[PDB]
Ligand binder design. Structure first.
Ligand SMILES: CC(C)CCC[C@@H](C)[C@H]1CC[C@H]2[C@@H]3CC=C4C[C@@H](O)CC[C@]4(C)[C@H]3CC[C@]12C
Ligand SMILES: CC(C)CCC[C@@H](C)[C@H]1CC[C@H]2[C@@H]3CC=C4C[C@@H](O)CC[C@]4(C)[C@H]3CC[C@]12C
Ligand SMILES: *[C@@H]1O[C@H](CO)[C@@H](O)[C@H](O)[C@H]1NC(C)=O
Ligand SMILES: [Ca+2]
Ligand SMILES: [Ca+2]
Lengths: 262, 50, 250, 274, 155, 60
């Protein structure tokens, strides 16, 4: 297993080389020590294929090896349009660690276990995303364009919410400051199915959902401003969604995994 | 005119409502010339003059 | 007395493969029709997605009867999933009373018909565990309802106590009008539900402490309410939503 | 009189407690002693709703001789109710004694058999989760003490807009600073900053006593706002070693704690199923 | 120096914690179960590594503006800080806000030579959340079922 | 008459139009940077918002 060591060292050290780079800077010494670092690695990584290719004439992880070495083989050149293609193969250097998954036993075992878990829980995942689509469709016909608001609370129309208005710092009448008037939509709206698919995901993640609840509660009419506590019975939509998706279909996922592993 | 301003100083107007009440009354007394008479009262289950 | 052309083309035409596989196509058409809508729609889309509604509802209402006198009434009504489509079509032909004054708008019942898209799922691997899934979740429905009712009572009690402690006390001179209050019963219930799910549970605690005086010995003792609420609510949430899942799924 | 304790009395009393619950639901609180007519009628109704319970409790004692449990709870809520009514009528304390009206629905729920059974199951499942409640109590102590040693009062400075003391003028989020020779968030452009500041969040979140740091650790364990505390202890002490606290507390006290709870619960569920 | 050395007494406290048969049994069994499977942690480690590098190269060039959800503490401008940001998203603090702050059109650092940002934010911050949740749940269930024999024993 | 329409929001290339309403598609929070001007009054996907005008090059 000497050669396997001879690598499991080099590939991981190359990974840590590609990790401790300089994000914000394009010209530096860290990205020049590590800019010309990958010439010992790239040739020895390619030489492994050359030593092993002639022993055969193709299995699966060898394709990954070919791709991860061709990433360097191509990104060395390319030239021409140096605003793209190099900018995606720069990201595509995140496949060096995945080369170690084949040359280290047990890693294949755990990866295959996770993929068979995918195979077992695909049904629950599909059911959850179907219910996501369903609830998005119901919510579209419930909050379609009603979640608009103006910076000035005294205007309730996009035509009226224009020009400037006076804002007072910390509710002090003696410090007026002019602000413009802007018809701003909510951060997580319900205008179309896709937008609701993200709003409901953020609700199911239990992050920022009170703001959505207390913004949708104030919605009364399309293309109009909000009214304080216009409808409080609309909280039942969010309550039922949290109970059915954020609780039932997640704990069912966990219970499926637990009972399957048991 | 003969304005007489009644200010609700019950318990429920405590907080933001009192701040806007105390400002709005301050800005309607400024729409009065010297030909007009005005007084300010308040009720909290008992009428009085502030 | 003369069904020599009725029953032969009743059972052997609603279960004759193509009938199914085309009912699935029409279900996909309906879900496309209801899904393909947004805010500020074009005129043509508004016209077509309004015309096709009854154009599909009439066919599906006919399909009701075509499958009805094929399997009779007993075999039609025994199936639980048959009654789901029964209610869907009933609501579809019923919504033309409240269509007068919107209320339910184009009621999201046309969605709930995509449970009949699991017909395609029917032939998929381990669909005879999804039927078993709902089967168990409906067979143990009495215990499920008892657990849910106990959790709801816990929430109600901690909401009544919440509005008794912090009722009309989140009124400081600060400009904003924070809506995580304990003023009414709906608002107290929403606040308790928000604290129970963990989201911003430390932002209502600060309001409660600042309302009951401030950081001090007697003032900073009301955090016990929020701490007990969080601990007990999470524990009961686990004991309900994981016991139900584990028991029914096993 | 131990012959009217049959069904009619039981259902009647359950209806009374349910009506009391709905009465409490309507009651609605008002800021600083205000009240509408509904609150002036519910306080009248919650005198019949007290006389009914007093009459019920008067017959049982001279009929059954208080140790039944829920009977004891009913007795406590009843005696507190009479004491509250007497005090309210003789004083024209309200906060203290209107709280037992939430203990009242507990006595309600302890009338239905298949809710008492569910509660018994829940309490029986709670018993194994006591070692994993002791270890969660002996982590919010070990880390609270460590926080006491490391961040005792180090977060009390803030930018002050040098030109006068004024009042903490620095954005709409007063955040700690440093003295340059320190290692925190310098106010940089002018705005020299000095001590004498309540705290990061009105003084409720800080490592000062064994109480304000036995709550700051709890918040960082429930993972709801641990980054906000990490940043406050970061730009007040430096950015070199404040993470070995706030990540070793969540990979030891919020995952290896949520792991044991799930394991024990799953085990108990499996055992009960078998 | 001095601050480090004041700390040891909490270890005597944790020994006092260790006192008790049930605590010792539970904790020793769970630690031996965790050590029994070291190849399940090198999936979460790999995931954190890959997404830290990807986010560092794609979304991390923006200026550290204290008014947004990218500042001197929350940024992609170094590998440890990127790992901290991914950890914060994994615990689910403000991941939607960071996703919004990674939306395209943000002014980037003047030291780097408003076109900075990307629309990859939605896919990254959704896929990372889902995959991290799955891997953590897999680790939890693996360590639970390795000790299931002890968990259900009927003492 | 003239407002620049393009698919890639960065280059901001110019395209002809016929509608008498020039719009402005910006993000819901970072509104200073204008992603896409143009003609007509289209529908904004997420995360985006649209303001529509009365004349050509009214958006500014
Ligand atoms: C939540 C229930 C089930 C159990 C916990 C009881 C809680 C609600 C009790 C126990 C201790 C109590 C506090 C004890 C002392 C004071 C100081 C006083 O000046 C105002 C009331 C206040 C702040 C009390 C509020 C209510 C309180 C926090
Ligand atoms: C909710 C369950 C546990 C029953 C209710 C118990 C709690 C909420 C009740 C019972 C005793 C009550 C306390 C008794 C006396 C006073 C003194 C008064 O000056 C302030 C309120 C305070 C401090 C009360 C706060 C609320 C209290 C702690
Ligand atoms: C960046 O910071 C400057 C100075 O604090 C501020 O004026 C500007 O609005 C900020 N921009 C963004 C996009 O946060
Ligand atoms: Ca009033
Ligand atoms: Ca949160």
């Amino acid at each position: 297993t000497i050669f396997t060591n001879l690598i499991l060292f080099f590939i991981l050290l190359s990974s840590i080389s590609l990790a401790a780079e300089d994000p914000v800077q394009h010209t530096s010494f860290r990205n020049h020590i590590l800019g010309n670092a990958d010439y010992v690695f790239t040739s020895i990584f390619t030489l492994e294929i050359i030593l092993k290719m002639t022993a055969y004439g193709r299995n699966y992880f060898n394709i990954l090896d070919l791709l991860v070495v061709s990433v360097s083989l191509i990104s060395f050149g390319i030239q021409s349009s140096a605003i793209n293609v190099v900018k995606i193969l720069r990201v595509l250097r995140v496949l060096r660690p995945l080369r170690a998954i084949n040359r280290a036993k047990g890693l294949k075992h755990v990866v295959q276990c996770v993929f068979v878990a995918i195979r077992t829980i695909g049904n629950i995942v599909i059911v959850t995303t179907l219910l996501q689509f369903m609830f998005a469709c119901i919510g579209v016909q419930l909050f379609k364009g009603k979640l608009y608001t103006c910076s000035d609370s005294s205007k309730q129309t996009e035509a009226e919410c224009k020009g400037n208005y006076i804002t007072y710092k910390d509710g002090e009448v003696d410090h007026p400051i002019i602000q413009p008037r802007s018809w701003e939509n909510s951060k997580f709206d319900f205008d179309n199915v896709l937008a609701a698919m993200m709003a409901l995901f953020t609700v199911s993640t239990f992050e920022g959902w009170p703001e959505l609840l207390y913004r949708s509660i104030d919605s009364h009419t399309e293309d109009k401003g909000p009214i304080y506590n216009y409808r409080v019975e609309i909280s039942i939509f969010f309550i039922i969604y949290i109970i059915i998706i954020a609780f039932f279909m997640m704990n069912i996922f966990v219970g499926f995994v637990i009972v399957t592993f048991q | 005119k003969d304005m007489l301003i009644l200010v609700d100083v019950s318990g429920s107007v405590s907080g933001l409502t009192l701040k806007l009440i105390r400002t709005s009354v301050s800005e309607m007394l400024e729409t009065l010339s010297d030909d007009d008479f005005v007084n300010v009262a308040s009720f909290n289950s008992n009428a009085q003059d502030v | 007395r003369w069904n020599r052309f009725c029953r032969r083309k009743c059972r052997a035409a609603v279960k004759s493969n193509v009938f199914y596989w085309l009912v699935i196509f029409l279900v996909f058409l309906n879900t496309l029709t209801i899904a393909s809508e947004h805010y500020n729609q074009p005129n043509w889309l508004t016209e077509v997605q309004d015309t096709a509604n009854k154009a599909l509802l009439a066919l599906f209402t006919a399909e009701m009867l075509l499958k009805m006198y094929s399997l009779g009434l007993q075999a039609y009504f025994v199936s639980l999933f048959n009654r789901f489509d029964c209610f869907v079509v009933c609501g579809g032909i019923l919504e033309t009373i409240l269509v007068e004054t919107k209320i339910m708008s184009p009621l999201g019942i046309s969605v709930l018909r995509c449970v009949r898209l699991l017909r395609i799922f029917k032939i998929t691997r381990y669909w005879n565990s999804l039927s078993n899934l709902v089967a168990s979740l409906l067979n143990s429905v009495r215990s499920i309802a008892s657990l849910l009712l106990l959790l709801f009572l816990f929430i109600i009690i901690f909401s009544l106590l919440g509005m008794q402690l912090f009722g009309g006390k989140f009124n400081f001179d600060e400009m904003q009008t924070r809506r995580s209050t304990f003023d009414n019963f709906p608002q107290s219930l929403l606040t308790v539900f928000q604290i129970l799910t963990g989201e911003d549970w430390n932002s209502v605690m600060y309001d409660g402490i600042m309302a009951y005086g401030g950081p001090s010995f007697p003032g900073m003792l009301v955090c016990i309410y929020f701490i007990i609420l969080f601990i007990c609510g999470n524990y009961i949430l686990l004991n309900v939503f994981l016991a139900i899942a584990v028991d029914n799924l096993a | 009189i131990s012959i009217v304790e049959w069904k009619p009395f039981e259902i009647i009393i359950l209806l009374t407690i349910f009506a009391n619950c709905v009465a409490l639901a309507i009651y609605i609180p008002f800021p600083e002693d205000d009240s509408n007519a509904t609150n002036s009628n519910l306080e009248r109704v919650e005198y019949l709703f007290l006389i009914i319970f007093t009459v019920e409790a008067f017959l049982k004692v001279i009929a059954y001789g208080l140790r039944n449990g829920w009977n004891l709870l009913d007795f406590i809520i009843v005696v507190v109710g009479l004491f509250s009514a007497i005090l309210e009528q003789a004083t024209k304390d309200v906060k203290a004694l209107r709280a037992f009206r939430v203990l009242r629905p507990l006595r309600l729920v302890s009338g239905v058999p298949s809710l008492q059974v569910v509660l018994n199951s829940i309490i029986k499942a709670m018993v194994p989760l006591l070692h994993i409640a002791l270890l969660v109590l002996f982590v919010i102590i070990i880390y609270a003490i460590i926080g006491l040693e490391l961040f005792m009062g180090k977060m009390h400075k803030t930018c002050y807009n040098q030109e006068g003391i004024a009042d903490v003028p620095a954005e709409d989020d007063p955040s700690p600073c440093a003295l340059e020779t320190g290692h925190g968030r310098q106010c940089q452009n002018g705005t020299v900053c000095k001590p004498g500041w309540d705290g990061p969040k009105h003084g409720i979140t800080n490592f000062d006593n064994f109480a304000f740091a036995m709550l700051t650790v709890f918040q960082c364990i429930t993972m709801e706002g641990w980054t906000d505390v990490l940043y406050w202890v970061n730009d007040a002490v430096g950015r070199d070693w404040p993470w070995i606290y706030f990540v070793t507390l969540i990979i030891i006290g919020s995952f290896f704690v949520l792991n044991l709870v799930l394991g024990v619960l799953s085990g108990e569920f499996s055992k009960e199923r078998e | 120096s001095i601050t480090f050395f004041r700390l040891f007494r909490v270890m005597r406290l944790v020994k006092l914690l260790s006192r008790g048969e049930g605590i010792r049994t539970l904790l020793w069994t769970f630690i031996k179960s965790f050590q029994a499977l070291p190849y399940v942690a090198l999936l979460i480690v790999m995931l954190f590594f890959i997404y830290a590098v990807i986010g560092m190269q794609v979304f991390g060039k923006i200026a550290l503006n204290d008014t947004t959800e990218i500042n001197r503490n929350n940024n992609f401008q170094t590998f440890p800080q990127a790992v901290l940001l991914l950890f914060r998203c994994a615990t689910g603090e403000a991941w939607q806000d960071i996703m919004l702050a990674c939306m395209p059109g943000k002014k980037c650092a003047p030291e780097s030579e408003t076109p900075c940002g990307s629309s990859f934010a939605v896919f990254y911050f959704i896929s990372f959340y889902m995959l991290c949740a799955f891997l953590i749940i897999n680790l939890f269930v693996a360590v639970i079922m390795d000790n299931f024999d002890y968990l259900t024993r009927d003492w | 008459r003239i407002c620049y329409i393009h698919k890639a929001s960065l280059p901001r290339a110019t395209k002809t139009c016929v509608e008498n309403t020039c719009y402005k598609m910006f993000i819901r929070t970072q509104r200073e940077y204008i992603s896409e001007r143009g003609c007509g009054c289209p529908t904004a996907m997420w995360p985006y918002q649209t303001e529509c005008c009365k004349g050509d090059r009214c958006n500014k």
